[PDB]
Amino acid sequence: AMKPRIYVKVKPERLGAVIGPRGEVKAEIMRRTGTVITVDTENSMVIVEPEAEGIPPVNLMKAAEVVKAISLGFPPEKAFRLLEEDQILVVVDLKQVVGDSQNHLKRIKGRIIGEGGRARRTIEEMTDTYINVGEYEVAIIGDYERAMAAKQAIEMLAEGRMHSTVYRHLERIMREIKRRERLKMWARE
Template identity: 45%
Template sequence: MSFKGFPVAINPRRVGVLIGRRGETKKSIEELFKVKLTVDSKTATVYVMPDEGATPLHVMRAKQVIEAISIGFNPEDALLLSDERYLLEMVDLSDIARNRNDLQRIKARVIGEGGRARKTIEEMSGARIVVS
């Protein structure tokens, strides 16, 4: 059995977004991070294989971009992770919610009416936020 690369699980509904039109998003990730991506749609797994000249940091950043796309970031925002000033931080709101209704309320507060709270947080902090 040969090494396919480092596996990254992806939301099956986001595989198309990861690949992009005519494979453009996948190609951008491969070129930017010096990796080869193999997408297994059946298992919703992406294998990240380092190419020549790739460092462990390239592989780690490529995996983070894939994870960001998987949780709902658009590819343009996810690719900001190529800049070392950006990092991916995932917060599981269910860890602080007591029940399902509590979780709904917390998500609604973060998003705000018409997305205004989320937009304000993004503008003031420079962060990109996805609530899913």
């Protein structure tokens, strides 16, 4: 029977994380969204379907986003954040910057992560987002504006900008976002 179906290609090395021990992870995703998730181990492909026709698109789409987030490197616990209202997944493909250069990729990942993971944590704290630096993809989870702010900061670091430069810029962007939110709130109540 025809129904909405979202196919999600999963990195082979992450299929176990998506399924979870005894299938506990996919089971939990299914439980919270009202979806049915089928796994094709040989093709490392996951199919997300609604359990009933009345399951809304957002439930199906977010279930698929959680799977994509785990595939990208996020542990299930962090990926589940995508089930929350207004949370989205944004990805920065570092090869768009350094192409196929392994050495350049390693160097920029060093800048993005920072000594002791200080750079990655600073961006996460400033934007209130979860950031995962995978093989060559940096995945970000947060609301639209904050995720886009983090994306920009990550791109700036991948391009060689000083850390202080990036933080100062992010500071301006985030103070603007929060100020606007506070004013909208004040104005409403």
